[PDB]
Design a protein around this ligand. Sequence first.
Ligand SMILES: N#Cc1ccc(N2CCN(CCCCc3c[nH]c4cc(O)c(C#N)cc34)CC2)cc1
Length: 207
Amino acid sequence: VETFAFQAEIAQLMSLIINTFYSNKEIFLRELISNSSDALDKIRYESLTDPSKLDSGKELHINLIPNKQDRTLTIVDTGIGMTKADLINNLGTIAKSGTKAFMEALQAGADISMIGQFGVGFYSAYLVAEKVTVITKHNDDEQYAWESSAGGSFTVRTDTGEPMGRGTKVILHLKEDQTEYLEERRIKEIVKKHSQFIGYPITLFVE
Ligand SMILES: N#Cc1ccc(N2CCN(CCCCc3c[nH]c4cc(O)c(C#N)cc34)CC2)cc1
């Protein structure tokens, strides 16, 4: 297991998301589903020129899987997946400018629900999760687990869990007072409200 420090500005953003009083937390799900959709768009586009990229799985879709026993909500997709370099370097570097702009916008009167307009919607996960685990598999690479409970650091390791084929699984370890997002009717409500026209099947598992 390798442990890394967040860039200072990203650590600052995560603390802001964790510490700021803001009741409209449900928007986290839209941001994560949007990121899944983008990843599915990507593998779909690449396969138009290289069909063999779907050898790792042809079905393009999103599963939402609540687990009250583990207190997790998992978002699973069969998109393009992420490389080790994505998890350690690339996505963090890209996030620097959007993080800066978002925090400046909040100072000028924007609210947290606008976070996706700055390309850093992922971090809204920490509105509801004490820990986020991301398992991912890209065609050109091994299966990895990225994880962070904030506090300035994250880890990356090779994942030895069930093989995924291709795609990304975001496991939200929910805060004790955010278990409403494990309820079928609540998740259904949020998907209909904010993610109504996503161009891939979204299957909400029940327990
Ligand atoms: N400094 C720094 C720094 C160093 C690393 C990170 N992480 C780099 C990995 N990220 C993993 C989540 C990426 C965002 C995401 C949410 N739902 C998805 C669904 C998907 O299908 C794909 C794909 N493909 C992507 C996502 C976390 C942040 C941050 C900051």
